[PDB]
């Protein structure tokens, strides 16, 4: 069974729709499975928002330390970091960190609001050459993940390309690229997703996402010990709105497509 057959087979079993894009930066080869199909990003979109703020910070040396007031009314449905700071401030950097490493939804909203709304995140993606990404909503509604809804979607390939540009490539100035990489490496939410499909000692940065329709996503940059990085997007979504998430599928997909390194 080739890698495509293995992915086909994984999807066939899975009860959903799998999207995979792996970029092997050794030779810019790719492993693609429904890679041009749209999927709801859910919190994987947070990478774009955080990166947009990093881009701004390249021309404003005070931005990352800018205070953002956190009010109880800013809290939404999943705020593990921001709730610790109500009535205080968090800096934009701290919001980036919380958004990326804990998937804090208030943090995401503060990034988006700082930037001037979801459309500003889209424009930032566009500025990186990503013609596919769109951010339409704030948290929490960007996670509705309704089948066929274009809002808050991208394709696996588009996101893989952009993630590579962001973390290893030309999108950000070097200190901000490194900051993004640091943030992704320090993610806390991805143990059971792509990381679980990889050799335990490979260094990985990732951002998960999850939403309704059992939408279960992860985007990762992977640094094998003896090989050039891999950039991997695994998106997964299911037909029924209250489907359980399926991080196991993402781990399985990651194992399939990284088997060689």
Technique behind this structure? X-ray
Three-class SS of residue 235? strand
Residue 253: name the closest of 211, 216, 203 by CA.
216
Residue 68: name the closest of 87, 92, 50, 102 by CA.
92
CA distances from 166 to 52, 176, 211 (A): 10, 9, 24
Give the chain's end-to-end CA distance (angstroms, integer): 18
CA–CA dist 171, 226 (Å, integer): 25
Three-class SS of residue 29? strand
Neighbouring-strand partners of residue 39: 154
Resolution in A: 1.0
Please compute, for residue 99, the number of CA atoms within 13 A of its CA located in the half-sphere on the CB side.
30
**241: Cβ–Cβ under 8 A, 6 or more apart, which residues?**
146, 212, 213
Is 2.40.128.20 the CATH number for 1-261? no
Q: Match 């088997």 to its residue by tokens.
A: 259
Domain ranges within the chain, ordered by starting residue: 1-261
CA–CA dist 158, 26 (Å, integer): 19
CA distances from 96 to 17, 107, 246, 247 (A): 30, 7, 26, 23
Residue 216: name the closest of 186, 252, 182 by CA.
252
**74: Cβ–Cβ under 8 A, 6 or more apart, which residues?**
82, 86, 106, 109, 110
What DSSP assignment string belongs to 161-203?
HHHHHHHHSTTS-HHHHHHHHHHHHT-SS-TTTGGGGS-TTSE
Q: Match 């709105």 to its residue by tokens.
A: 241
């Amino acid at each position: 069974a080739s890698v495509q057959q293995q992915l086909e087979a994984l999807e066939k079993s899975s009860g959903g729709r799998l999207g995979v894009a792996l970029i092997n930066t050794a030779d810019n080869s790719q492993i693609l499975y429904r890679a041009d199909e749209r999927f709801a990003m859910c919190a994987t979109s947070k990478v774009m928002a955080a990166a947009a703020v990093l881009k701004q910070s390249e021309s404003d040396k005070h931005l990352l330390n800018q205070r953002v007031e956190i009010k109880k009314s800013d809290l939404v449905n999943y705020n593990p970091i921001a709730e610790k700071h109500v009535n205080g401030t968090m800096t934009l950097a701290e919001l980036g960190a919380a958004a990326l490493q804990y998937s804090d939804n208030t943090a995401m909203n503060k990034l988006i609001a700082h930037l001037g709304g979801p459309d500003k995140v889209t424009a930032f993606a566009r500025s990186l050459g990503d013609e596919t990404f769109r951010l339409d909503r704030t948290e929490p509604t960007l996670n509705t993940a309704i089948p066929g809804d274009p809002r808050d979607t991208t394709t696996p390939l588009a996101m893989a390309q952009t993630l590579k540009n962001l973390t290893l490539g030309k999108a950000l100035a070097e200190t901000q690229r490194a900051q993004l990489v640091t943030w992704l490496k320090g993610n806390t939410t991805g143990s059971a997703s792509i990381r679980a499909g990889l050799p335990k000692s490979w260094v990985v940065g990732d951002k998960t996402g999850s939403g309704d329709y059992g939408t279960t996503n992860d985007i990762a940059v992977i640094w094998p010990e003896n090989h050039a990085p891999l950039v991997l997007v695994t998106y997964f979504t299911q037909p029924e709105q209250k489907a359980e998430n399926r991080n196991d599928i993402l781990a399985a997909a990651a194992k399939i497509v990284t088997h060689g390194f």
